[PDB]
Design a protein. Structure first.
Lengths: 5, 423, 5
């Protein structure tokens, strides 16, 4: 999924 | 240049003109490049005096000199910024925002930007003292072009510090109050104003989807995409960071980035000479390939799959690892036809070469992508051709050798691939 | 973060 980083 | 003792003697004279000349001497000391004696000035106990001078409305020269001196102290370490705050400077500087002298008001804007930029605690303390209303009032003109250039740049930078830092993020009502002015600055044709406005937007989008929605709901995405294609690196960098933050939200928020035409800029971003630009652009791509199948199709239609193959083939390792994530997200959510097109573009060979990297997670990311591609080949009954392709690149050697990797997540994936498609 | 004048 989306990888906030 | 005076000594600290002579500055202390002049300030303790209770002669206003002697105090003015001593304060100016302290400001010139604090303005030298090589080692300003900030701690010596603090240890001399001069900060409370400087703060008192900020309220001498009848002597604007000493207001300016003391504000400038305090600004240089507040620009130092966190202990030095704290000493300025501990001297009561926050409410005094906020009162100076209403000064009829532009250079004095600008100095207060500058000082509050340094205080707020220390961290979320001082940022929220500046907000609690009521700095936002007088700051925004300085920008309440029909056309920003009538303001002085340096004055406008200082206000933009200070506003961006009020948007900065997390744990916690700035108060929602403060962000809502600032956003309309921030959108004005994001459309102002000055490179420094644009850069700091983009940084502020990148701060506000670095959070949960509710925070991202607040920014998107101001219509700034088309302007961000426009600034994404600027020639100034100090503008593209925060613009790309803001775009990258927005595509970490919902698929509808990601779709507005695509609808604004952002994917047309990525051929140059994914080949940019600046390593950090390539890394963040590939990171942005990984979060787009984690979206819907129609959004993956947008990546395909813009010709971006060969560019992902290229970044995976040759780039800095941190960029290559973002590319491996982009492929795994692509293969996880893509259709069979989209996955076949990815292999046809030559993804297999550079994918196998990175199985020799020492980073453990990138190996797990690649093995997941290889697993997803096999599942697409199972639906087509073409697992034998994929196994051959992986063999002729030397990848079977690496998949086989990864069974005595110590990490337990790797041998399971490697063994399951060896059993099901090779042995 | 912070700028000196």
């Amino acid at each position: 999924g989306r990888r906030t980083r | 240049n005076w000594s600290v003792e002579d500055i202390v003697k002049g300030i303790n004279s209770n002669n206003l003109e002697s105090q003015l000349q001593a304060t100016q001497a302290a400001r010139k000391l604090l303005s030298r490049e090589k080692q300003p004696p900030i701690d010596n000035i603090i240890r001399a106990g001069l900060i409370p005096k400087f703060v008192s001078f900020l309220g001498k409305t009848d002597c604007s020269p000493i207001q300016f000199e003391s504000a400038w001196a305090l600004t240089n102290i507040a620009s130092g370490t966190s202990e030095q910024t704290k000493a300025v705050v501990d001297g009561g400077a926050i409410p005094a500087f906020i009162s100076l925002l209403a000064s009829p002298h532009a250079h004095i008001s600008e100095q207060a804007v500058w000082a509050l930007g340094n205080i707020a930029g220390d961290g979320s605690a001082f940022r929220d303390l500046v907000i609690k003292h009521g700095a936002i209303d007088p700051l925004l009032a300085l920008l309440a003109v029909p056309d920003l072009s009538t303001l002085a250039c340096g004055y406008l740049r200082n206000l933009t930078w200070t506003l961006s510090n009020l948007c900065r830092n997390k744990n916690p993020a700035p108060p929602l009502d403060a962000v809502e109050q600032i956003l309309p002015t921030l959108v004005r600055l994001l459309h102002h044709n000055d490179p420094e104003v644009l850069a700091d406005s983009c940084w502020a937007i990148s701060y506000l989008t670095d959070g949960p989807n509710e925070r991202i929605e607040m920014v998107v709901k101001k219509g700034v995405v088309p302007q961000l995409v426009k600034l994404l294609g600027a020639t100034e690196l100090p503008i593209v960098t925060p613009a790309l960071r803001a775009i990258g933050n927005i595509v970490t939200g919902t698929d509808e928020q990601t779709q507005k980035v695509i609808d604004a035409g952002a994917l047309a800029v990525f051929p140059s971003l994914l080949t940019n000479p600046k390593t950090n630009i390539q890394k963040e652009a590939t990171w942005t791509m990984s979060n787009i390939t984690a979206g819907r199948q129609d959004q993956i199709q947008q990546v395909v239609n813009h010709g971006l799959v060969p560019f992902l193959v290229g970044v995976l083939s040759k780039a800095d390792f941190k960029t290559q690892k973002e590319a491996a994530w982009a492929i795994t997200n692509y293969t996880s959510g893509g259709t069979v036809e989209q996955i076949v097109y990815l292999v046809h573009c030559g993804i297999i060979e550079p994918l196998m070469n990175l199985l020799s990297a020492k980073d453990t997670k990138i190996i797990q990311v690649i093995l997941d992508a290889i697993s997803n591609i096999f599942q697409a080949a199972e639906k087509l009954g073409e697992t034998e051709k994929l196994s051959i392709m992986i063999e002729e690149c030397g990848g079977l050697d690496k998949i086989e050798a990864l069974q005595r990797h110590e990490n337990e997540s790797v041998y399971k994936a490697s063994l399951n691939l060896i059993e099901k498609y090779f042995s």
